[PDB]
């Protein structure tokens, strides 16, 4: 696969690395998502517990206490906007 397909494939692989551990196999629990953030995000381990909790709460749009794949894409989009804004000044 090409560099772009490989990067996307890596990001999808990360999701499933954690989503299948407990509860629903294809969604992220509060526990799984916090773990994903703390281990996969550069600044994840340094965030306040209250701020991770607010982050996870907001990602959940359908309000079922579960972060599906589409919610994870919202997170990726937020990260992309952050890096893009920094580069513009």
């Amino acid at each position: 696969a090409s560099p772009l397909d490989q990067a996307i494939g890596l990001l999808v692989a990360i999701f499933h690395k954690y989503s299948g551990r407990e509860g629903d196999k294809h969604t992220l629990s509060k526990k799984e998502l916090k773990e994903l953030i703390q281990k996969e995000l550069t600044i994840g381990s340094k965030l306040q517990d209250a701020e991770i909790a607010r982050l996870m709460e907001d990602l959940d749009r359908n309000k079922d206490q579960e972060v599906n794949f589409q919610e994870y894409v919202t997170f990726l989009g937020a990260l992309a906007l952050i890096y893009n804004e920094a580069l513009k000044g």
Binding site: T27, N62, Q70
Partner: protein, 101 residues
């Protein structure tokens, strides 16, 4: 492509459970099935009914019962749901009757 092998008899009643609706209130739901000609695919709603309603109904527990499964019922059935994001349930069950055309 994944499908469950289920044997059935023509004109014989059959009941099955198709969960999916989360712990939240009754959300939206859509019925879809893949077959050669497809003549059973109907749109299920939490408040309303159609033609397939007379052919088969859904139990309050989210089940499905048919007065008599015939050749028209043959094929593969599939369940699906629609939330506020895009969390849908995927499941296909292969059903076939004894005597076929």
């Amino acid at each position: 492509a994944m499908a469950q092998n289920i044997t059935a008899r023509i004109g014989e009643p059959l009941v099955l459970k198709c969960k999916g609706a989360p712990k939240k209130p009754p959300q939206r739901l859509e019925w879809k099935l893949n077959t050669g000609r497809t003549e059973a695919w109907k749109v299920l709603s939490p408040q309303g009914g159609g033609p397939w309603d007379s052919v088969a109904r859904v139990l309050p527990n989210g089940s499905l019962f048919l007065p008599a499964v015939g050749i028209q019922d043959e094929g593969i059935f599939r369940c699906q749901a629609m939330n506020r994001n895009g969390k849908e349930t995927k499941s296909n069950y292969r059903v076939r009757v004894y005597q076929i055309p």
